[PDB]
Amino acid sequence: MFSDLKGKRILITGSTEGIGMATAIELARYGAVVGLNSHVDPADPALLLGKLREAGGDGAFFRADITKTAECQRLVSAFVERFDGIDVLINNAGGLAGRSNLENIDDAFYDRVMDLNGRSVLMMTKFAIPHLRASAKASGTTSAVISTGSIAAREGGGIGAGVYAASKAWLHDIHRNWVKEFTKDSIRFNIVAPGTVANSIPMGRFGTVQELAPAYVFFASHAASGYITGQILDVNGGQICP
Amino acid sequence: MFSDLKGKRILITGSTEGIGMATAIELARYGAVVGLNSHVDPADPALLLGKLREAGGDGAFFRADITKTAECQRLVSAFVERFDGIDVLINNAGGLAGRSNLENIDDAFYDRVMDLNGRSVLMMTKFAIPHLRASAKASGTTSAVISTGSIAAREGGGIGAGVYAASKAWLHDIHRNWVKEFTKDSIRFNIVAPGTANSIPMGRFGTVQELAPAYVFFASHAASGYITGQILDVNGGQICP
Amino acid sequence: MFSDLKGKRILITGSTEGIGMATAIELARYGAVVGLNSHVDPADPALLLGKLREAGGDGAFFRADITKTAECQRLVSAFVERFDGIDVLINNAGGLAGRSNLENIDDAFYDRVMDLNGRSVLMMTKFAIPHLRASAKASGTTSAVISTGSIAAREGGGIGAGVYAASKAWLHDIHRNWVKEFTKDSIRFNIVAPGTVANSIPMGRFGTVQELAPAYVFFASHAASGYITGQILDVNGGQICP
Amino acid sequence: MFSDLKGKRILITGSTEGIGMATAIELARYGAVVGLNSHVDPADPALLLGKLREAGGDGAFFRADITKTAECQRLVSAFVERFDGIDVLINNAGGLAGRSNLENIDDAFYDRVMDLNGRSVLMMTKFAIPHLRASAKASGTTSAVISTGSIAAREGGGIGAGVYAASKAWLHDIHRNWVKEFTKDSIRFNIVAPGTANSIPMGRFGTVQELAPAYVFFASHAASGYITGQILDVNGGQICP
Ligand SMILES: NC(=O)c1ccc[n+]([C@@H]2O[C@H](COP(=O)([O-])OP(=O)(O)OC[C@H]3O[C@@H](n4cnc5c(N)ncnc54)[C@H](O)[C@@H]3O)[C@@H](O)[C@H]2O)c1
Ligand SMILES: NC(=O)c1ccc[n+]([C@@H]2O[C@H](COP(=O)([O-])OP(=O)(O)OC[C@H]3O[C@@H](n4cnc5c(N)ncnc54)[C@H](O)[C@@H]3O)[C@@H](O)[C@H]2O)c1
Numbered sequence: 001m002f003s004d005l006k007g008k009r010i011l012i013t014g015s016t017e018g019i020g021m022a023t024a025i026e027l028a029r030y031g032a033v034v035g036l037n038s039h040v041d042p043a044d045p046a047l048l049l050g051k052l053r054e055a056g057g058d059g060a061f062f063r064a065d066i067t068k069t070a071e072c073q074r075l076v077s078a079f080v081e082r083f084d085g086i087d088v089l090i091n092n093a094g095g096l097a098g099r100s101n102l103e104n105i106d107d108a109f110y111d112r113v114m115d116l117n118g119r120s121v122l123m124m125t126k127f128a129i130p131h132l133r134a135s136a137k138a139s140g141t142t143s144a145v146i147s148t149g150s151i152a153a154r155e156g157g158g159i160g161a162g163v164y165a166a167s168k169a170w171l172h173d174i175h176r177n178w179v180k181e182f183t184k185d186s187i188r189f190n191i192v193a194p195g196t197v198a199n200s201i202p203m204g205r206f207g208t209v210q211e212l213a214p215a216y217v218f219f220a221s222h223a224a225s226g227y228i229t230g231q232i233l234d235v236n237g238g239q240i241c242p
Numbered sequence: 243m244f245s246d247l248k249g250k251r252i253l254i255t256g257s258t259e260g261i262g263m264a265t266a267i268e269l270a271r272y273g274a275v276v277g278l279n280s281h282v283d284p285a286d287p288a289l290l291l292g293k294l295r296e297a298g299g300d301g302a303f304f305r306a307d308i309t310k311t312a313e314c315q316r317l318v319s320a321f322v323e324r325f326d327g328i329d330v331l332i333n334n335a336g337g338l339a340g341r342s343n344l345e346n347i348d349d350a351f352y353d354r355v356m357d358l359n360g361r362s363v364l365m366m367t368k369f370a371i372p373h374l375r376a377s378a379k380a381s382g383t384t385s386a387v388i389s390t391g392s393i394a395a396r397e398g399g400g401i402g403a404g405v406y407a408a409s410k411a412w413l414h415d416i417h418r419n420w421v422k423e424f425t426k427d428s429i430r431f432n433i434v435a436p437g438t439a440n441s442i443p444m445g446r447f448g449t450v451q452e453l454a455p456a457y458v459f460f461a462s463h464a465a466s467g468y469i470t471g472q473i474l475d476v477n478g479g480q481i482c483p
Numbered sequence: 484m485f486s487d488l489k490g491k492r493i494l495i496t497g498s499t500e501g502i503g504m505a506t507a508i509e510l511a512r513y514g515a516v517v518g519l520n521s522h523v524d525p526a527d528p529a530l531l532l533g534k535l536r537e538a539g540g541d542g543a544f545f546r547a548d549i550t551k552t553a554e555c556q557r558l559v560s561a562f563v564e565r566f567d568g569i570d571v572l573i574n575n576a577g578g579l580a581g582r583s584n585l586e587n588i589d590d591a592f593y594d595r596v597m598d599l600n601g602r603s604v605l606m607m608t609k610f611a612i613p614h615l616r617a618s619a620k621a622s623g624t625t626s627a628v629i630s631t632g633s634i635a636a637r638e639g640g641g642i643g644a645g646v647y648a649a650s651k652a653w654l655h656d657i658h659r660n661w662v663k664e665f666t667k668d669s670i671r672f673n674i675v676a677p678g679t680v681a682n683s684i685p686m687g688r689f690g691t692v693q694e695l696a697p698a699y700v701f702f703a704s705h706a707a708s709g710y711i712t713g714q715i716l717d718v719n720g721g722q723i724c725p
Numbered sequence: 726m727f728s729d730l731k732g733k734r735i736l737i738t739g740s741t742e743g744i745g746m747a748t749a750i751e752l753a754r755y756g757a758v759v760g761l762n763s764h765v766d767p768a769d770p771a772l773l774l775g776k777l778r779e780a781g782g783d784g785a786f787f788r789a790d791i792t793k794t795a796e797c798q799r800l801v802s803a804f805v806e807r808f809d810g811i812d813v814l815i816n817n818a819g820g821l822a823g824r825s826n827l828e829n830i831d832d833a834f835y836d837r838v839m840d841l842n843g844r845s846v847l848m849m850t851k852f853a854i855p856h857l858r859a860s861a862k863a864s865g866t867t868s869a870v871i872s873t874g875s876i877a878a879r880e881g882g883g884i885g886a887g888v889y890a891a892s893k894a895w896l897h898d899i900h901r902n903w904v905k906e907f908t909k910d911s912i913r914f915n916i917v918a919p920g921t922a923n924s925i926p927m928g929r930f931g932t933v934q935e936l937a938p939a940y941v942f943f944a945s946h947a948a949s950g951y952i953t954g955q956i957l958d959v960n961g962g963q964i965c966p
Contacts (some may be wrong), residue, residue, distance in 0.1 A: 001271070003243075003329060014349065015776065024903060032311040034795075069832050070833075090276075100476070100904060100909075101906065102847075102850065102851050102854065102902075102903065103854055103855070105847065105851060105852060107794050107796075107844070110843075110847060111842060114839065114843070118745075118835075118839070119832070119835060121368070122827075122830065122835065122888075123830075125827070126827050126828060129827060129828060130828070133819070147343075152898075153898060154898070155724065155901055156316065156724065156898055156899065156900070156901025156902035156903075156905060156954075157901075157902055159902075159905055159906050162899050162902030162903065162906070165846075165897070165898055165899060165901070165902050166843075166895040166896070166899035167895065167896030168897045168903065169878075169891075169893070169894040169895055169897060169899075170891040170892070170894055170895040170898075170899075172894065173877075173878060173879075173881055173882075173883070173890055173891045173893075173894030173895075174881070174887045174888070174890065174891035174894075175482070176482040176880060176881025176890070177881035177882055177883075177886070177887035177890050177891065178827065178881075178887065179443055179479045179881065180443065180483055180881060180883070180884050181826065181827055181884050181885075181887070182827075183443035183444055183478075183479055187335045202421055202422065202425035202426070202470065202471075203425055203470070204426075209466075211467055211468035212468075214459070214464070214466065215459075215463040215465075215466070215469070218455075218459055218465075223455070225455065225456075226452055227444065227448045227452035227453075227476055227477070227478055228456075228474070228475070228476050228477075229443065229444065229478065229479045230443075230479045230482030230881075231474060231475050231476075231483075232483070233469070233474060234469075234472050235468055235469050236468075237468050237470065238421045238422075238425050238470045238471045240471075241417070241418040241421055241470075241471030241472065241638065241639065242472075242473070242483075256819070259618075298604070299608075311589075311590050319587060340626060343664065344605075344608070344609050344612060344664055344665075345612060345613070346611060346660065347605065349552050349602070352601075352602060352605065353520075354514070356597065356601070360593075360597070360649075361590070361593060362517075364585075364588065364593060364646075367585065368585050368588060371585065371586055372586070391584045395652075395656060396656075397659060397965070398656055398657070398658070398659025398660035398661075398662065398713075399656075399660055400660075400663070400966065401660075401663050401664050403606075403660070404660035404661065404664070406658070407656055407657065407659070407660050408652075408653040408654070408656045408657035408660065410656075411652040411653055411655065411656030411657075412649040412650065412652055412653040412656075413649070414637060414652060415635075415637070415639055415648055415649045415651075415652030415653075416639065416645050416648060416649035416652075417639070418638055418639025418640075418648070419585075419639035419642075419644070419645030419649065420585065420639075420645065421639065421650050422639060422641075422642055423584065423585060423642050423645070424585075430504055471639075479674060482881065484727075485756070512726065546941075569827070574909075621813075634844035658965070659965040662926055662965055663926065666927055666961075666962055668819045685904055685905065685908035685909070685953065685954075686908055686951065686953070690951045691951075694950055694951035695951075696944070697947070697948040697949065698942075698948075698949070698952070701938075701942055701948075706938070707938040708938065708939075709935055710927065710932070710935035710936075710959055710960070710961055711939075711957070711958070711959050711960075712926065712927065712961065712962045712965075713727045713926075713962045714957060714958050714959075714964030714965070714966075715957050715966070716952070716955060716957060717952075718951055718952050719951075719952045720951050720953065721904045721905075721908050721953045722952075724901040724904055724954030724955065725955075725956070725966075
């Protein structure tokens with residue numbers, strides 16, 4: 001029972017596939033209204049919305065390359081134009097964007113990874129704060145941000161992935177800064193931290209997207225996680241037990 | 243969608259009131275057969291079965307003092323005699339059991355606190371294992387332990403409660419041990435860590451109602467099937483680890 | 484330069500060998516006065532004191548089985564009788580005291596490990612607090628406790644070692660409780676956390692006692708670590724990077 | 726006994742004042758040849774060499790702006806031209822570079838903060854590596870990086886300083902990455918994490934004098950030769966992780 005998610009307007013960056021899409025459908029199951037998003041158009045946008053509505057909810061697609069601040073602005077504007085505000089921001093866009101030994105790491109590499117995993121999440125969240133704040137007065141209860149983190153935030157990632165690791169630790173920490181700045185506004189901030197999606201994983205296998213979605217649902221519903229904020233749930237098969 | 247909780251046999255310690263009852267109820271909402279528990283008999287046993295049954299499930303009460311190892315064995319054997327198995331165990335029993343500054347701590351105090359928060363958890367978990375082992379063999383999925391931690395494990399607790407604090411740090415960490423030993427038996431282990439009020443960002447205290455959903459989440463293979471060895475801190479941001 | 488350790492009276496439990504003895508000698512190098520200790524008499528007590536004095540300092544041996552509270556009392560009494568107080572308590576006694584799969588863990592096993600790693604450190608520290616407090620008024624500066632922890636406090640130890648792991652996490656946390664109770668008394672509390680003393684260790688080898696001693700020296704000198712309290716230094720070759 | 730610091734070539738960024746100078750001095754006490762550094766020329770360069778020389782060692786000042794990657798390369802090349810190597814690098818440069826609430830953060834702010842605390846560290850470390858690689862090959866022991874972290878990496882920092890906070894969390898964690906890549910080159914990485922006053926158990930602030938010894942400890946193979954990937958928090962108990 002996440003019935004308090006019916007009608008909730010939930011914007012998810014980087015959600016035309018993987019964890020993002022699977023989460024979109026699970027939110028849809030409780031009748032949520034979901035902004036899908038990506039930097040390039042999917043092959044079949046209607047089919048994705050079909051899957052949402054099929055599952056019991058609704059939504060629209062919005063294309064934006066959120067490694068640019070302007071685009072994060074434009075994306076929040078559009079979703080808010082279409083529906084009238086945001087009840088939940090899910091920062092899911094992110095990713096490696098390459099591996100490089102430290103000695104071959106030039107400025108471009110740094111900038112690529114940090115725009116994808118750093119600036120994007122900062123700026124998206126910034127532009128959504130206004131609407132999330134207002135969303136929360138209106139409901140009475142709370143708005144939410146959920147950001148996708150990583151096991152790499154904690155243990156430094158694989159070789160090649162130092163910047164990605166660091167960018168994720170950057171996120172885990174900046175959430176703690178936002179719990180300070182915005183709990184008075186009744187906006188909660190939580191992280192799902194995938195791990196990888198064997199045999200340094202106690203369970204002996206990589207996760208499936210269907211195994212990551214429920215946690216997002218959990219942090220999304222105020223009825224289920226209303227007292228929880230500034231926490232990190234690692235969904236990694238025991239791979240790290242912090 | 244917690245429908246896989248239908249018929250799940252869920253023994254809960256320290257469950258006649260507080261977080262324990264709340265959690266029993268919420269689980270009972272999904273057709274869980276819950277074992278309620280306390281050292282003392284409660285005033286109205288059948289209300290409590292009522293609440294479970296009202297909510298959508300079933301259960302039974304067992305008196306037992308878990309600060310003792312024979313009692314723990316008994317409780318697990320009683321629960322199994324009644325329901326033929328364990329699918330989820332929830333180590334919720336625990337508490338301060340007094341307050342004392344270091345200079346005033348004797349063996350009796352230390353023994354009281356650690357028997358309540360350490361030995362209990364250890365032994366309950368020890369005796370449940372082969373039952374939980376068998377459940378997951380049968381279901382094809384995973385069985386589950388959940389235990390009630392505390393903010394105090396992370397930041398040391400408050401003056402006079404060092405032993406309780408450390409008992410909780412002890413639990414947090416021994417759960418990491420069990421992940422190593424038992425993940426191959428398809429048994430998951432997770433912890434719900436209640437916080438304790440101008441040091442709590444949400445300006446206020448938790449309520450049992452705000453705690454129980456967490457436990458439901460960790461109890462369900464469909465929800466948290468790939469999650470083990472974690473601690474979900476439910477505390478209005480009191481600490482953000 | 485740890486010249487501020489000359490004459491400092493430093494009681495170290497479980498110090499007739501391993502990390503304990505090596506630490507004793509390194510403190511001795513700066514002219515400290517060191518209580519050695521163990522639950523059984525060494526073969527040659529004079530040779531150990533010889534090594535202390537040889538290195539540039541002094542001390543005495545005190546036998547006590549500190550798994551009993553009475554003995555911790557008796558041990559602190561004796562060291563304080565001999566010298567007139569304690570400037571530094573080093574809780575080094577501890578250890579596995581067996582491995583057991585959880586299903587074979589009876590009460591005795593629990594009790595053995597917890598007395599060795601839990602009650603001992605609690606009670607030793609308790610009985611020393613009085614004297615450490617007074618030591619600190621007299622000096623002006625600070626007293627110190629240093630406790631030997633473990634990598635196992637953080638990641639749950641090896642199979643068989645769950646109670647030992649847990650007992651060490653217990654210690655890491657209870658120190659945080661004592662930073663609260665006793666910083667007003669100018670008593671600092673720090674932990675050295677050995678790890679193991681290969682190839683899940685970046686350095687590819689186990690530590691040597693000579694590689695653990697310096698850290699104890701560091702936390703022992705007020706001139707070097709006077710502003711540091713409630714911290715844990717892991718000395719493990721990168722084995723865990725918290 | 727830090728005698729192995731004799732003749733060690735120790736490039737330090739952000740070292741004309743504060744923790745950086747203090748640390749240079751203390752290292753200079755053991756016969757270290759230190760590289761002082763700032764974006765701006767200081768008033769009296771030779772006093773500073775004086776302090777190093779007085780204390781027991783030697784050194785040289787290099788102007789460079791490390792928020793820029795070409796400048797970082799230059800500094801490492803300059804330092805090597807002068808002293809023929811690097812044995813220790815200390816990434817101490819960094820700071821708030823302004824304060825801003827989230828709703829007022831533009832790209833320029835973010836770029837300013839991360840260039841100062843992220844790019845700098847990364848690039849300094851990148852360019853030093855092969856020098857540090859060569860030192861440890863020659864010594865037979867280990868060479869060393871030390872970097873100045875912050876309490877803020879752990880608890881989020883204060884309102885208006887999110888980016889700085891996260892920049893420090895970023896550093897803490899990338900040091901873990903480097904341990905993996907570079908431990909086999911015998912290069913250690915450790916972090917000294919200054920705290921920032923009724924939330925500090927010692928009722929008071931740190932002083933540069935209370936900070937520098939830590940750095941000395943991490944700088945010496947004899948002292949900290951088996952220590953890598955750690956963060957020593959110097960903060961009067963402000964946080965106890
Ligand atoms: N609420 C807080 O401030 C806080 C903070 C940190 C942790 N916790 C943890 O929350 C958990 C549960 O607390 P609670 O909500 O049930 O509060 P509570 O006051 O209701 O605890 C009493 C409950 O546990 C049972 N109980 C007590 N001793 C028992 C024993 N020896 N054997 C069997 N049952 C026993 C009682 O009968 C009752 O059901 C504990 O483990 C506690 O350490 C609470
Ligand atoms: N003291 C605190 O409150 C506190 C708390 C957390 C972290 N820190 C960290 O302490 C470290 C050092 O602080 P500090 O003691 O030197 O204080 P500081 O005020 O002295 O910092 C200025 C120093 O760094 C140099 N510097 C500044 N920008 C530079 C640049 N672009 N290139 C080269 N050099 C530059 C200055 O010339 C000077 O030597 C920083 O990384 C900071 O983030 C400090």
